[PDB]
From a paper:
Human T-cell Leukaemia Virus type 1 ([name]-1) is an untreatable retrovirus that causes lethal malignancies and degenerative inflammatory conditions. Here, we show that high-resolution crystal structures of the mature-length [name]-1c CA protein define essential lattice interfaces and identify a distinct ligand-binding pocket. However, our structures reveal that [name]-1 does still have a pocket formed between helices 3, 4, and 5, albeit an electropositive one capable of binding to either phosphate or sulfate in vitro.
To obtain higher resolution, we expressed residues A128-L214 (CACTD), which were purified as a dimer and crystallised in space group P212121 with diffraction to 1.47 Å resolution. The structure revealed a short 310 helix followed by α-helices 8 to 11. The asymmetric unit comprised 6 copies with two possible dimer configurations: one mediated by helix 9, and the other by an interdigitation of residues R188 and H190 in the 10-11 loop. This unbiased approach returned a CTD dimer virtually identical to that mediated by α-helix 9 in the CACTD structure (RMSD = 1.580 Å), suggesting that this is the biologically relevant dimer interface. Curiously, while this residue is well-resolved in the electron density map from the CACTD structure, it makes an aromatic stacking interaction with its counterpart in the dimer partner that necessitates a breaking of the two-fold symmetry. The positive dihedral value observed for our CTD dimer supports the presence of the immature arrangement in our crystal packing. Y113F was chosen in order to remove only the hydroxyl group of the side chain, which binds to a water molecule, bridging this residue to the sulfate/phosphate groups. Unsurprisingly, Y174A reduced infectivity to zero, albeit without affecting particle production.
Author numbering:
A (entry chain B): 128 to 209
B (entry chain A): 128 to 211
């Protein structure tokens, strides 16, 4: 039983963080079973499967009423090398 | 949009990593809807909800066909500052 496709979505080393989060959001929207809450799974995977540089930025992210927004904001100044 | 309880399971600053992962495993067994694959979500939370010291150890973990085992092994020698 291979893992679902949404479990192997990894941020590219040159991929903008917001693009990765958008891809992951759609994969979970489409692939998580009915009645499974997407939001907390998205937030966890958007950290654990982010690239190494963005994981460091995410560890120091904010603590607001918009927890997904806090993750995007923490990486908003990050620039891929290429 | 109150998150489920399994999503607020956080490794204490003084909590052994294996005990934290077990608490995640139980919370998902009882909280995650029956039929949603637990293992990828357990592995994800075992990083995202881990304490900073164990997150650093996890950064150097291996890359095998046993990804949860890689996480457990990476933190298997970490001991909290207060053992009580």
């Amino acid at each position: 039983a291979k893992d679902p496709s949404w479990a192997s979505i990894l941020q590219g080393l040159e991929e903008p963080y917001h693009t990765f989060v958008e891809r992951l959001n759609v994969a979970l929207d489409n692939g998580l079973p009915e009645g499974t809450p997407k939001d907390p799974i998205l937030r966890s995977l958007a950290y654990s499967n982010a690239n190494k540089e963005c994981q460091k930025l995410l560890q120091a992210r904010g603590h607001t009423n918009s927890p997904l927004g806090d993750m995007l904001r923490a990486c908003q100044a990050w620039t891929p090398k290429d």
